[PDB]
Symmetry: C2
Subunit: 120 residues, 2 copies
């Protein structure tokens, strides 16, 4: 179950869940990129993978988070794998801080994520 489950637990447990899911993230990077529909980025700072396909995913799913120089390797891998990459700084930051990897997007980012998927 990839449910974010927002109405459940303190900000403390949510941070433990984020860390725990990040700790099991991998992956490797190539596979993470390949399984994504789109990457949302803050260049040289943040890359977040998003998967959304009608019929498989009820909501957009966060597939990975990478930071700093890794973003440049994500960009290169995305180009080789044909995964579009978009600069969306506020969305990249919010997903960085709040989203759990391998879970559906938080409620607060539904509007912004929908915007990128219309583009895609």
């Amino acid at each position: 179950k990839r449910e974010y489950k927002e109405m459940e637990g303190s900000p403390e447990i949510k941070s433990k869940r984020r860390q725990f899911h990040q700790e099991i993230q991998s992956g490797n990077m190539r596979e993470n990129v390949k399984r994504s529909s789109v990457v949302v980025a803050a260049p040289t700072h943040i890359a977040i993978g998003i998967l959304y396909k009608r019929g498989e995913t009820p909501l957009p799913l966060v597939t990975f988070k990478y930071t700093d120089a890794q973003v440049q390797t994500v960009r290169k891998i995305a180009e080789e794998e044909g995964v579009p990459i978009l600069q969306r700084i506020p969305l990249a930051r919010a997903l960085y801080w709040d989203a759990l990897v391998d879970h559906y997007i938080p409620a607060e980012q539904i509007e912004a994520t929908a915007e990128v998927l219309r583009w895609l």
Copy 2:
């Protein structure tokens, strides 16, 4: 030399430097906390260590970055070691993204960092 060296290199090299310095960060956590003067935090999201002592450090130095559930362990260690911990969300975020660990604070955060050190 703990010089941030801001007028040098692209945002790309700065991200490689950040990652590289983060990769050699440790540390362990207890030692990182003990060597700090103060911790600046965004609760459940970010803890940044700052060291400043007249005569040793020309400028405040960033000693560590920790995120998510680690912040709770930082808080507990800081209490045991007598290191004050302050909630400063915009400063914590800016240092998270821009500062290099074991280097002097970026120029943009001089004003905000000075503010916390007057308090301390």
